[PDB]
Amino acid sequence: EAPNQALLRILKETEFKKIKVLGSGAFGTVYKGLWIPEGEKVKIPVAIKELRESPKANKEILDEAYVMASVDNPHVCRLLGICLTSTVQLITQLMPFGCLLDYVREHKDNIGSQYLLNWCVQIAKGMNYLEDRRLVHRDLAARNVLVKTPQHVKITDFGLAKLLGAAAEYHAEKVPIKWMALESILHRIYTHQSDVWSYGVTVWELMTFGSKPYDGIPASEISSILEKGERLPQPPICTIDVYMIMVKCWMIDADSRPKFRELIIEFSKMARDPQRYLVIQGD
Ligand SMILES: */C=C\C(=O)Nc1cc(Nc2nccc(-c3cn(C)c4ccccc34)n2)c(OC)cc1N(C)CCN(C)C
Ligand SMILES: [Cl-]
């Protein structure tokens, strides 16, 4: 390994400021923000995630965070800094174009085949990087893929599930059922191959330009629906070559699903001749 490595920074409250709210949740709030490293003159657009609030827990939280800061891939968000002063705050680089989910909804008219296929490649490369690290994301969704540029997206919120662990309120009180693999839903089994299921859902969200999955069906019904063998419909732009890939991700047998390495090859091949695999008007 190289001498220089990515390192988590512990930040002071003075260092960064919240400018506006980007998103909200039971977890907390995410803010558009500015970071200035201590004793430095540079201002860095950040996103600050502040959890609803621990001190004993702080040591546990720190261990989770260190991993999140070790992630070193172009397609995975890296946790830059943490602050534990009153409540946990997580600092990452700001992604100016927001998430893909909102992106494909806004720009539905104007998105070409090459862009969509390319995003599919980048998400798979990032997931593959995590799998090599033996890290399981557990929450892959279009909402959690962010746009640095039309040509650069990154998977966010890796490892957040564990952190939300440090907790009891968290358990005594939710999971993204619609995105989840069946094993995850029934036994809370999380693997790279349950991440591959969610990858397929994420691709479906992109290919339909942001449609909510299983919109009629309620979440509770979903397990029954899957066992019955129903699956998300083929998106209209998708050719069967693309859909069969999605279908493979959603197979009940985990080992049967495609590996991330395979997905990169497959979507790379499609990206090379985009019009062949996606039929969009104005392409
Ligand atoms: C899918 C919603 C979304 O992310 N919208 C969004 C995001 C950003 N920038 C940004 N950068 C880094 C990290 C995040 C981020 C991480 N997590 C877990 C978030 C949850 C909720 C919101 C943002 C999160 N976000 C952004 O920067 C310009 C703008 C933006 N949008 C789309 C504007 C707000 N609309 C949702 C109204
Ligand atoms: Cl939504």
From Swiss-Prot:
ATP binds at residues 22-30, 49, 92-93, 157. Ubiquitously expressed. Isoform 2 is also expressed in ovarian cancers. Phosphorylated on Tyr residues in response to EGF. Dephosphorylation by PTPRJ prevents endocytosis and stabilizes the receptor at the plasma membrane. Dephosphorylated by PTPN1 and PTPN2. Monoubiquitinated and polyubiquitinated upon EGF stimulation; which does not affect tyrosine kinase activity or signaling capacity but may play a role in lysosomal targeting. Polyubiquitin linkage is mainly through 'Lys-63', but linkage through 'Lys-48', 'Lys-11' and 'Lys-29' also occurs. Deubiquitination by OTUD7B prevents degradation. Ubiquitinated by RNF115 and RNF126. Ubiquitinated by ZNRF1 or CBL at different lysines in response to EGF stimulation; leading to recruitment of the ESCRT machinery and subsequent degradation in the lysosomes. Changing residue 10 to A: Abolishes phosphorylation. The active site is at residue 139. The modification N6-(2-hydroxyisobutyryl)lysine is found at residue 49. Changing residue 70 to I: Found in a lung cancer sample; constitutively activated kinase with higher levels of basal autophosphorylation; more sensitive to gefitinib than wild-type. Changing residue 13 to K: Found in a lung cancer sample. Changing residue 38 to K: Found in a lung cancer sample. Changing residue 140 to V: Found in a lung cancer sample; more sensitive to gefitinib than wild-type. Changing residue 23 to D: Found in a lung cancer sample. Receptor tyrosine kinase binding ligands of the EGF family and activating several signaling cascades to convert extracellular cues into appropriate cellular responses. Known ligands include EGF, TGFA/TGF-alpha, AREG, epigen/EPGN, BTC/betacellulin, epiregulin/EREG and HBEGF/heparin-binding EGF. Ligand binding triggers receptor homo- and/or heterodimerization and autophosphorylation on key cytoplasmic residues. The phosphorylated receptor recruits adapter proteins like GRB2 which in turn activates complex downstream signaling cascades. Isoform 2 may act as an antagonist of EGF action. Belongs to the protein kinase superfamily. Tyr protein kinase family. EGF receptor subfamily. Binding of the ligand triggers homo- and/or heterodimerization of the receptor triggering its autophosphorylation. Heterodimer with ERBB2. Forms a complex with CCDC88A/GIV (via SH2-like regions) and GNAI3 which leads to enhanced EGFR signaling and triggering of cell migration; binding to CCDC88A requires autophosphorylation of the EGFR C-terminal region, and ligand stimulation is required for recruitment of GNAI3 to the complex. Interacts with ERRFI1; inhibits dimerization of the kinase domain and autophosphorylation. Part of a complex with ERBB2 and either PIK3C2A or PIK3C2B. This is Epidermal growth factor receptor. The chain holds residues 697 to 984 of 1210 of the full protein.
